[model samples]
Target: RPRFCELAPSAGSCFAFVPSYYYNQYSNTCHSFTYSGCGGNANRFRTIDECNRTCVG
Candidate 1:
């Protein structure tokens, strides 16, 4: 499993949700989409399980 970290609201950044995906220098697996309204940053999911878990839990 991949490591999960919830970014908190620090340094004046309003971290509403945790980004589900990550970019690795060794691996090539980057997926992202721009979000509307609340924030411009995109929310991501590394895998189906991560998406499901975040949605349900």
Candidate 2:
């Protein structure tokens, strides 16, 4: 959480817009995001349960 949980999600520099779930520490919530398939952070999760389980402030 020191780094991963506080990091922001990015769509990446790629053109792909894959649907994804990302954890937000501000609200301690998991929300859907548009993933660009490349050049992003560890904040992106495959599922809400997966996201919250890893990062729940």
Candidate 3:
């Protein structure tokens, strides 16, 4: 089954323990973002590997 990739919203400039993950709607690829230690969307992931694994087929 083809699953939609997770897309992370812009969080400005910051870094934290949890990394943000976003999916390229066109490219169909997973990307990483700087996430702060706060609230975020479901499109976020803990690690790059995790993001790729879940989003990437």
Candidate 4:
């Protein structure tokens, strides 16, 4: 996982149906969550493949 991968998944402060993926260091894999379409960290990825390819083993 990358440094930002250490950050927890954030839904942020908005009303959104955006599905986003993040790298989970604990599980050593990428996981999906609903993003609120607002302020989120670099941890957020548009797709699981992108997340895993960048941060996960």
> What TM-score would every model get versus the actual structure?
0.25, 0.80, 0.49, 0.76
Query: What is each predicted model's overall lDDT from 0 to 1?
Result: 0.36, 0.76, 0.58, 0.77
Q: What's the lDDT of the predicted structure labeled candidate 3? A: 0.58
Residue 49's lDDT within candidate 4 is 87
Enumerate clash totals for all models, in the order shown: 0, 0, 0, 0
In model 4, which residue pairs have backbone atoms overlapping below 3 Å? none
Off by over 4 Å in 2: none
| Model 3 C-alpha lDDT per residue in residues 14-37, reported as the tens digit of each score | 555555667554665667766666
Off by over 4 Å in 4: none
**Candidate 1, 1-57: lDDT as tens digits:** 233322221322444554344333233333332222343322245564554454423
- Per-residue lDDT over 4-45 for candidate 2, one digit per residue giving the tens place of the 0 to 100 score: 856666675677878888777778788888787877777778
Candidate 4 per-residue lDDT over residues 1-57, each given as its tens digit: 668867755565666778888778778888887776676667888998888888887
**Candidate 2 lDDT (Cα, whole model)?**
0.76
Q: Which candidate wins on lDDT? A: 4
